């Protein structure tokens, strides 16, 4: 029974990963073929830039604004900056904007979404000058609606590019997200790659490679059939036509009986999907963002993401039929993502309850080999030798993602003690259960029989695995001491911060 479980788990992971790699390679070939026909000095689509921020550090906000100003695209109608401020602290962010751009910071009294006239002309008067707006704190969706209205004011605008207050773009991060929109008439949304620059801590180092794998592999295969599930927060381009149609059933979102205050990018992509439109992902557009360093904050972020995932999965399954044959792969991916967590949980429970050293060692070695292959592919693709650190990510997935996913279902399906134990008690219980299972397996199997071949195999395998993880951690420590793990962007940003 254990052999069946291990073999089925290994195949069910590796075969699907290989298929995703093949589909992503085909998508990359198609994108390169499309790009090869682009004439030199191409500027046809008129784009509007929308940035939404809320209490961002002045240094990163200034860097983001300057990088946006550094774009090589020559057809930009207007820059729109929306701030959830109007108290006092965000006046400093407005001052940073005034340092980077013109002195045009409007102070509307009410949000456009709640206004009786959802028109941009109410608060805006010029369509050619960059505008910064301070609005009452209502969330990111409400601020994005104002940006959409302001971009829809101009009848010559053909597309919008959405950037976060922290994302730092490259010199050609706008030209690459707006070309696929003009390649196929059925494409109405383009997704851009997101990278992590503050790869100093171990957790950030693992999260960077997780992002790389979930962008290059997970979304390229989806974009081969032009059915990208999530466009993405840091970078993303949309057509004004589809936005003028989907922006109405997007601010009044309801799930069971309450408004939604999380996501704001996955549902927007899903609404495009339900209308039969096509969405692509370009790997040639790069946007740099940061990742949380503390483990608890990362767990909170993961559970917040899973909260929206557990609804939009059914929402996308209810509309996958409209696309046609393309969508069978989408439903298969949805079922794979649903069943993978259950398979992992069941396998862990089965190998923990039955304290057998052979099965545990075989599972550990099989998982190590699978993650080694996965990290090797990423190292080959990214030309970076640090991608092998991804072999450690399994630990995170067993200590920061599974409890977060469990909490995301146990709290959504339904003083300070309730505010703190509502998001961390399940994680503590999971850690205690894992530790108790380990102690039980060690105590139950407490013997040394070197005359048995299988005991030798189990002990040698576990020792080799410990040596492998130890040398990986030692390499990480040596790299951190030598500052070899620092990204070039982080190396420049540290010097800029020192100079300030």
């Amino acid at each position: 029974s254990a052999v069946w479980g291990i073999s089925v788990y290994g195949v069910f992971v590796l075969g699907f990963y290989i298929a995703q790699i093949v589909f992503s390679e085909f998508n990359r070939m198609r994108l390169s073929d499309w790009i090869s026909l682009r004439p030199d000095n191409w500027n046809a689509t008129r784009v509007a830039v929308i940035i939404a921020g809320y209490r961002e550090d002045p240094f990163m906000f200034k860097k983001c604004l300057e990088s946006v100003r550094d774009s090589e695209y020559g057809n930009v109608a207007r820059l729109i900056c929306v701030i959830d401020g109007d108290e006092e602290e965000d006046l400093k962010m407005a001052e940073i904007y005034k340092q980077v751009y013109n002195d045009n910071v409007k102070k509307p009294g009410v949000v456009l979404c709640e206004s009786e006239n959802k028109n941009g002309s109410t608060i805006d008067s010029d369509v050619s000058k960059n505008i910064c707006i301070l609005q009452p704190h209502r969330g990111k969706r409400e601020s994005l609606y104002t940006g959409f209205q302001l971009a829809s004011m101009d009848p010559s605008v053909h597309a919008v590019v959405l950037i976060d207050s922290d994302t730092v773009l490259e010199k050609n991060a706008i030209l690459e997200v707006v070309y696929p929109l003009s390649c196929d008439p059925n494409i109405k949304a383009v997704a851009g790659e997101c990278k992590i620059w503050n790869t100093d801590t171990i957790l950030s180092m693992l999260v960077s490679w997780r992002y790389f794998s979930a962008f290059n592999v997970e979304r390229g295969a989806q974009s081969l059939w032009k059915t990208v599930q999530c466009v993405g927060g840091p970078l993303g381009a949309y057509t004004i036509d589809i936005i003028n149609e989907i922006k109405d059933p997007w601010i009044t979102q309801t799930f069971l009986g309450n408004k939604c205050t999380y996501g704001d990018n996955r549902r927007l992509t899903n609404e495009v999907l339900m209308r039969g439109k096509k969405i692509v992902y370009t790997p040639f557009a790069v946007g740099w963002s940061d990742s949380p360093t503390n483990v608890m904050r990362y767990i909170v972020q993961q559970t917040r993401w899973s909260k929206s995932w557990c609804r939009e999965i059914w929402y996308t399954l209810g509309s996958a039929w409209k696309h046609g044959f393309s969508g069978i792969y989408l439903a298969f991916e949805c079922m794979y993502q649903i069943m993978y967590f259950f398979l992992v949980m069941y396998l862990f429970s089965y190998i923990a309850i039955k304290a057998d050293i052979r099965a545990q060692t075989a599972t550990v070695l099989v998982s190590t080999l699978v993650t080694i292959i996965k990290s090797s592919y990423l190292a080959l693709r990214a030309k970076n030798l640090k991608a092998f650190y991804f072999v450690l990510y399994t630990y995170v997935y067993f200590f920061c993602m599974i409890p977060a996913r469990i909490t995301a279902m146990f709290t959504m399906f339904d003083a300070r003690v309730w505010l703190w134990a509502k998001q961390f008690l399940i994680t503590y219980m999971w850690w205690a259960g894992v530790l108790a299972a380990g102690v039980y397996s060690i105590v139950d199997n407490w013997y040394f029989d070197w005359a048995d071949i299988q005991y030798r195999f189990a002990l040698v395998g576990i020792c080799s695995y410990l040596v492998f993880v130890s040398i990986v951690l030692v390499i990480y420590l040596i790299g951190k001491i030598t500052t070899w793990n620092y990204t070039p962007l982080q190396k420049e940003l540290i010097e800029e911060r020192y100079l300030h």
């Epitope: 013997y447 029989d449 005359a451 048995d452 299988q454 005991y455």
Partner: nanobody, 124 residues
Framework: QVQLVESGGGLVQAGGSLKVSCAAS????????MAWFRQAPGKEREFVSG???????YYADSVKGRFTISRDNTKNTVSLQMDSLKPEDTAVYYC??????????????????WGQGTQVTVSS
Amino acid sequence: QVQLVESGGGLVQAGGSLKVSCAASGRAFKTYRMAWFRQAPGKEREFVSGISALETTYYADSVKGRFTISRDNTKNTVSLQMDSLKPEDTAVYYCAARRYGGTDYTTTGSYDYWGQGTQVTVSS
């Protein structure tokens, strides 16, 4: 510490079959490795059969197929079944248990615990 109690054994004619079994009382029988030893009239103890904690069976020469060793954790006892009895098989059988050991498993001194043993006689 584990206590071993023997059971089975008797007078069986040549070419017959006989099953013996030793039961162990202890905190955890699963981790123990069991072994069956023979003491001939020549009075020289030798290894005959063994079963490890991972259900691996070890047999001595000339008893590779004649002797079959089985283990049952539910009744925490190990049973040896012998077929095609031979005149040289009349001897005293002992059951031994081990918890910690190395490459050596054929030596009598490598097993910490021992049992009373039972006399098995074969008539031709």
